[PDB]
Design an enzyme around this catalytic site. Structure first.
Site, mmCIF file in Angstrom:
data_model
loop_
_atom_site.group_PDB
_atom_site.id
_atom_site.type_symbol
_atom_site.label_atom_id
_atom_site.label_comp_id
_atom_site.label_asym_id
_atom_site.label_seq_id
_atom_site.Cartn_x
_atom_site.Cartn_y
_atom_site.Cartn_z
ATOM 1 N N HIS A 81 -9.903 0.133 4.921
ATOM 2 C CA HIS A 81 -8.160 0.370 5.339
ATOM 3 C C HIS A 81 -8.393 1.463 6.961
ATOM 4 C CE1 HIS A 81 -4.343 2.667 6.009
ATOM 5 N NE2 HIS A 81 -4.224 1.083 5.169
ATOM 6 N N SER A 91 2.266 -3.246 11.124
ATOM 7 C CA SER A 91 4.122 -2.775 11.201
ATOM 8 C C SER A 91 4.891 -4.240 10.826
ATOM 9 C CB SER A 91 4.987 -1.999 11.588
ATOM 10 O OG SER A 91 6.384 -1.578 11.109
ATOM 11 N N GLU A 148 -7.417 3.855 7.657
ATOM 12 C CA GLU A 148 -6.677 5.749 7.380
ATOM 13 C C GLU A 148 -8.804 6.165 6.440
ATOM 14 O OE1 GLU A 148 -2.823 5.271 5.607
ATOM 15 O OE2 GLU A 148 -2.710 4.971 7.173
ATOM 16 N N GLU A 183 -5.390 -4.431 10.699
ATOM 17 C CA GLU A 183 -4.387 -3.843 11.340
ATOM 18 C C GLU A 183 -4.771 -3.257 11.945
ATOM 19 O OE1 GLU A 183 -6.575 -1.158 8.117
ATOM 20 O OE2 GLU A 183 -4.775 -1.193 7.759
ATOM 21 N N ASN A 223 0.472 -1.021 -0.067
ATOM 22 C CA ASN A 223 0.447 0.136 0.245
ATOM 23 C C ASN A 223 1.338 1.088 -0.095
ATOM 24 O OD1 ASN A 223 -2.302 1.765 -0.135
ATOM 25 N ND2 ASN A 223 -2.264 1.431 2.560
ATOM 26 N N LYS A 273 -0.512 4.318 0.416
ATOM 27 C CA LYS A 273 -0.455 5.449 0.499
ATOM 28 C C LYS A 273 -0.222 6.589 -0.556
ATOM 29 C CE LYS A 273 -0.354 3.166 4.692
ATOM 30 N NZ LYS A 273 -0.683 3.439 6.468
ATOM 31 N N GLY A 324 5.397 0.005 15.484
ATOM 32 C CA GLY A 324 7.044 -0.149 15.883
ATOM 33 C C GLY A 324 7.755 -0.646 14.623
HETATM 34 BR BR LIG Z 1 -0.875 -0.729 5.070
#
Ligand SMILES: [Br-]
Ligand SMILES: [Br-]
Ligand SMILES: [Ca+2]
Lengths: 240, 238
Positions: B93, B201, B95, B163, B9, B11, B169
């Site tokens: 997602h 992460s 976000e 996610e 991704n 972004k 981290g």
């Molecule tokens: Br992502």
């Protein structure tokens, strides 16, 4: 004839595919738009580059929205830097559908305006009151509040066009445009009021363009559905 | 067994020059057998990326809307995504949920529409730190998964991405619970065949250990997808 250069934006919204948009573009290219109209087309985001490559360079391309920083962790967004990289030179901000379907706040719209202008794009900054607001008698409050958020984020109005959308829907468009220009005169400057194009949005068609374009404070149009149709060329020619 | 799945991704990052260079490095990499790689460019670059990427890598949009055309300034539809040669969309997602306020209901409607239009869907779920620290991770992700599942008739073209929003981290613990959710609420067959990928992460230095976990079927990689170590992540099972 007009005091401000006639401006016609075509907002394709979420419509089209390569085949049909290629055909639309072919028709616009063949129209040979007049030098006295400033024409801007706003394709769906996936087609900004595709459309810019095929459209007559005399017609500008706009993105339909952007975000407020150059890069970052904003899945699904694009920045002014990407818009410029695709050859587009304008962005539509604050469109009624972003405000009312997608909940974009005035604060966020102001931040986007400031960032897009800093990055060198032109901005078509949209405002407008809903049916409940017009029925409640607060058209002026609503559009003046929206306009002030935009103005507070504009240092140079030369690359801004204000678009009034009659979301609620002598001419009613003219009444509102005259009030908006008076707001600019009293709160920015006479020079900004006299030079800033205030364009009418909503449902502009080949049948309404000549009458509306003759109104002294209506400087052009932000065209929705008719921008997908041959009559967009007639709207471009509304003052000819 | 479940084919290992690595999504990148990007972004809201990159321009034609920098993404062209990234794509050249991906085209030059050897993708291992039994590994499905997907890249999700910014929306302005879906067509560009599909034109430049070798067909061994699929392209995903980062979001879409829930009808084929309409008065939705600023949106794109599954039909447009497919018209640009992309075969996947990322939906839900973190976000979109937390910065842009997309509801579970809306996400479910998008999932149903994208699947009906022939796309694969990377359907994202995940809890925030305040939910993790309240002890309600399972309740949160089970409810998000239920809304997705209510909009999935055929799981063949769905990948679930967990996610944890705070994990910048464990992964295995949640993936095992999500697979058990699928087993009880859909079927054993769907539980055994559906990829559940980790979207916290992931870096070159952590990917091998995560990929060895029995209920982790790959990754939705964020920032590392812009870097050379994405190739190491593609090779996490090697
Ligand atoms: Br992502
Ligand atoms: Br419009
Ligand atoms: Ca595994």
């Amino acid at each position: 004839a007009p005091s401000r250069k006639f401006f016609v934006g075509g907002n394709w919204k979420m419509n089209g595919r390569k085949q049909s948009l290629g055909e639309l573009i072919g028709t616009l290219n063949a129209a040979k738009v007049p030098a006295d109209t400033e024409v801007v087309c706003a394709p769906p985001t996936a087609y900004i580059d595709f459309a810019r490559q095929k459209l007559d360079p005399k017609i500008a391309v706009a993105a339909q929205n952007c975000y407020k920083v150059t890069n970052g962790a904003f899945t699904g967004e694009i920045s002014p830097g990407m818009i410029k990289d695709c050859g587009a030179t304008w962005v539509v901000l604050g469109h009624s559908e972003r405000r009312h379907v997608f909940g974009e706040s005035d604060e966020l719209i102001g931040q986007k305006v400031a960032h897009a202008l800093a990055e060198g794009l032109g901005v078509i900054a949209c405002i407008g009151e809903k049916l409940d607001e017009r029925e409640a008698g607060i058209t002026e409050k609503v559009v003046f509040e929206q306009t002030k958020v935009i103005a507070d984020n504009v240092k140079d109005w030369s690359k801004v066009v204000l678009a009034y959308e009659p979301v609620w829907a002598p001419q009613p468009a003219q009444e509102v445009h005259e009030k908006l220009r008076g707001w600019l005169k009293s709160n920015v400057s006479d020079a900004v009021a006299q030079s800033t194009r205030i364009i009418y949005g909503g449902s502009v068609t080949g049948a309404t363009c000549k009458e509306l374009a003759s109104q002294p404070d209506v400087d052009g149009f932000l065209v929705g559905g008719a921008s997908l149709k041959p009559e967009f060329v007639d709207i471009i020619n509304a003052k000819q």
